[PDB]
Sequence to fold (1090 residues):
Amino acid sequence: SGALDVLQMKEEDVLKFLAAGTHLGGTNLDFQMEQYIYKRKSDGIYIINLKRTWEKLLLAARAIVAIENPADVSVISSRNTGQRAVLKFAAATGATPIAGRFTPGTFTNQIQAAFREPRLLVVTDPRADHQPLTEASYVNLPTIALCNTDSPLRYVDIAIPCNNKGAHSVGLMWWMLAREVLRMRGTISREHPWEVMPDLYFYRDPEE
Amino acid sequence: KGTEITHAVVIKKLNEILQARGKKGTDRAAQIELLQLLVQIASENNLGEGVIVKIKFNIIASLYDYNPNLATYMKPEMWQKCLDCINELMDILFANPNIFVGENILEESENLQNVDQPLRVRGCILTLVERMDEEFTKIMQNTDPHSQEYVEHLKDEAQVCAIIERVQRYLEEKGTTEEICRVYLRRILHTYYKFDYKAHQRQLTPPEGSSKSEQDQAENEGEDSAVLMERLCKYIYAKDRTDRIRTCAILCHIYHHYLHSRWYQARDLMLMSHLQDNIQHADPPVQILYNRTMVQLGICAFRQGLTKDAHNALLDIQSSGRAKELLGQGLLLRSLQERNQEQEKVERRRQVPFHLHINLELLECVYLVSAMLLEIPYMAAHESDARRRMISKQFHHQLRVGERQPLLGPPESMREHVVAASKAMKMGDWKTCHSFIINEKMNGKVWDLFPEADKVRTMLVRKIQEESLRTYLFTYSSVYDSISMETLSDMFELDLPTVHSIISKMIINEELMASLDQPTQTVVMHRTEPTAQQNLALQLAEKLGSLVENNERVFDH
Amino acid sequence: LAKEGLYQYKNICQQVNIKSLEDVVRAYLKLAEEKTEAAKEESQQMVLDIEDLDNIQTPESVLLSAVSGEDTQDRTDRLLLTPWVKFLWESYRQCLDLLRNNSRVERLYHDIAQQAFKFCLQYTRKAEFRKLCDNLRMHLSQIQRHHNQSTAINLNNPESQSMHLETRLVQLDSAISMELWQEAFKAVEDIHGLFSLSKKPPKPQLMANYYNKVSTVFWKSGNALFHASTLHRLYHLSREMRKNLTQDEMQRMSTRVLLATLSIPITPERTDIARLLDMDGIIVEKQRRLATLLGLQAPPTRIGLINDMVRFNVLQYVVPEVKDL
RNA sequence: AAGACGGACCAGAGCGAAAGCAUUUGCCAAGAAUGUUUUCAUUAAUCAAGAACGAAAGUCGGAGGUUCGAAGACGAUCAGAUACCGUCGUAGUUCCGACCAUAAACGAUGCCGACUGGCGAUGCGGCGGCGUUAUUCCCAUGACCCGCCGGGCAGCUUCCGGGAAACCAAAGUCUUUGGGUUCCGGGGGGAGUAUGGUUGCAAAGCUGAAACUUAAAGGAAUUGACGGAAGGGCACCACCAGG
Fold:
């Protein structure tokens, strides 16, 4: 797995999961995400399993790892809370950030304003990124999607359960998934955690 | 009304009350009143008068089931409807015997052997008397103490006890011996909290011009048939071995032996039946009755004035703060232990009626004062710079909670009357204790509780006089080298055969170096010395020096 | 009377102190009726109870008195109880009555002492006790709010004068002495600091002299070393008012000094043999400590405490029979 | 006074085989759901015949006719209106006891049984809750919340699958064709006419053709165009104010 110890959640991670609120989920019944739910709050708010978060945080990184290019890894964030995060994901991982609208046709559409050639897609919310997920399904593209307890799961390959909506739960996973790949391939090597905080991350919060 | 004919519809009109109860939803007001409609419509007699017999058997069953139905704890007027018709059914039964029980005298309308079992319905009539008794048990429990109406409901106990006579007299002792677990206990149930006050009106009313007719020679014997039937069914609780009730009876016999008889028997029967162990397996609400019993042992230790037994019957009780919950009245946040409310609901739906509550302020004045006259001359030996028997966890420690009170003015609390009399006991003046105890327990009505309390006071008069004479001798011991017997007979108001029993036991049992000439009535002591009491105080120290030095080698080897 | 009082908390914290003070008058008219509602049936049940015969009820009196059923009359006892929702709410209001409490410094602090002394002498001495602990806390925590409240405007000095009376009356009448005298001693000590805050007022100190003079009776009843403190504090704080107020009581002051001489030394030997084993030095410390409260820190002896009154020229001023005695 | 009818409350709700059922209250037996270590031991399934029920108008005979109201007629309407319209009104409506047996009795959609997906309600019963509220001195109630169980009403939602599409967890598990049982169609007519049967008091109901006629009829869906369909904008070849 790599260095198995910090790959079994450290309290630095564990607090940040609580700090970004990733453990929380929605209120909706699942049939593909209820495995990733730890428990539910009084009259229903789902505590997700951070074990399921981390173990999918490892393997979806390991899907990106041993691709010799982050250039054919197009990471996707239509949410503005992750647009700083995929900016700081592409700053750290080197992947291809996708902010905002997909502009339908980058994967189809010979005659088009653009064309991209990825291999794996990473998604903040497959409902907010369904237009990537359509053209992921069109031209044989696997897709990692951050899924909460209300997310869609059709055409969704390996899914990391997170709260991943609104809060810093978005920018923590991009802090963590860029952690996990530099943990595997980088100068934060040999499965060491980061020394870079998620304050280079979490989204802008227009300032004073 | 329902149907205007005889017997045949009426049993079906009887069974329709018997059938309609067994539902998840059932009102039972109509079930009661139609039975009275079937009383009057059975104007035929033994074609219908026997129908009333099962109607009165089923009125009470309809009256009883009517009030775990809305509230709660049956209303006592609904219970007095039970009290009316149980009386009325026995009024029928005294005129009845074994008719509509049938037993092939006739069959229609007869035969409680027709469905079913002619004694069992008669036996369940006795179980309807239980239903009169069970709600009255709640009525004695769930009615307020300060409420003067609680006394009004408590007046109906003799009316129940009348039926306890009237059943067993109409019995036909199938019901007696089969229910000798209970029908005998029904005789206990009106005995084991009863009083010597009526026994003073029974036995100590002089039978010279009062108990000359056979009227006071039948009702007073019924007052002591209850103290008879308990001994009559000691030997039947040899048969009816029934350790949930047998151990419970013998403790109530010990009640009768302590209160209703002489407490020498109650001391024996506790030693006799050995009820240290049976109480555990047999329903520890009987342990509450056991703890009620050894309290009442200490009561008749105090009624017989025995101070050690007032301390030693309050050994399973007053070595613990359990005695609050030994009447079942402790609070949940009284400590960090009493949890929870639902178990508190179980214990307090169970326990206890207010006439079954007792005076714990008396019990503390039983427990504290009894060792106050003991331990103070005892500690006056200790506080004479000679101590080896300092007993930890004692009335000494029950004194400590009242001792260190420099602000304490007038004695007003029950412990304050003890602690003031304790200081009066420490002065050696006997008279000063009597101001602090006897008047203040009349002020707090604690003396006002017994008819024997004048003797109990007079017993504790001499226990103050003889023992403060000892603290007179214990405290002023070094300079008393000649001690009178003529003066001390006049001083502490104690006659010579007491004083000879005092002063010899002051010389023999205390082992004071003292010459005595009882012909001359003179005690000659010469203790020698008070500066060598420090030599005794150092031999208090250095003897401990040799022991743990030896114990240093005892553990290590 | 409490849910509406929760409005009366927040609705009448709206600066109509005409309305606030009149409701304090109504806060007595709360209790003025339901004091009498018991007090009618105090007679009227006992009209019926004497009309009832105890001779026929003698086995029920055995069911009463051997049980100690103690036939109280709940006609009173429940009409006794319902003005406690009227009483205790106003005490519970009092700590929250900040920034002026002058409808209550004038009235309610003393109206509590008015209402308490009725119901304490009627039935409720234990409902007195914790309430006086409650009042002392709702004295203290109300001060510990410090939302525009001081003592030096003589706000807390009549709050003292009410609460001191609330202590000293029940103590003398019938109370446990260990507890309410601490409610007096914690009142007297703090308000000695509040007198120190409010530029020592000698007339509540003359009341404190009377609080000593009360205690001189009580410490000839309870503790001679406290009486060694208090009778020495009785006389000189009066002798200050002989100078401060210029008392022209030349028969009384010549006879209060002989009152101050004779009782003051008499401290015999202790009789407590167990208390010597039970660490007398803790007790004499409290005998010292509440004498430090009164300002006569070490409890003075037999003879040298006389000599305080002898060296001071008031022994000359004794009505001369005692002087000869 | 008369006779009529219980609005609103009143719903993707209930019950009832449908046709159906809206004042209260009572009686009467019924039926569903639910729960059920109860019982029967497979008694089950579906259905020609056969039978029940089956709106309405009609009719049979009354009551009834307040109200309305086929007919009916005007007043008005229009080239014509008998119609809509206004007026008056018969039968009818009202209701009883009959026939009638029909309806778009339509959900245009056999039964029963099986299997295949997501959610949130609601009527129901039973259950789970340190759930709330609520009464009596509080429990046990109930109102209600979360959850569950069903059998419901159904809804929403998805390459569940299909379908000509429309749409449909059924209108899926069909060419990879078969759960069982009943019913019905073979392009369009002529025509439910003829013909006979047949009932019904009749009105009419039911069973049920041929000659001849025809290469189209039909269905969805796309696209136009149209509208006395609806919603948008603009021009003095359109208005306004005007000359």
Notes: Residues 68-73, 142, 345 of chain B lie near RNA strand D (CB under 10 Å from a C1'). Chains B and A do not touch (no CB pair under 8 Å).
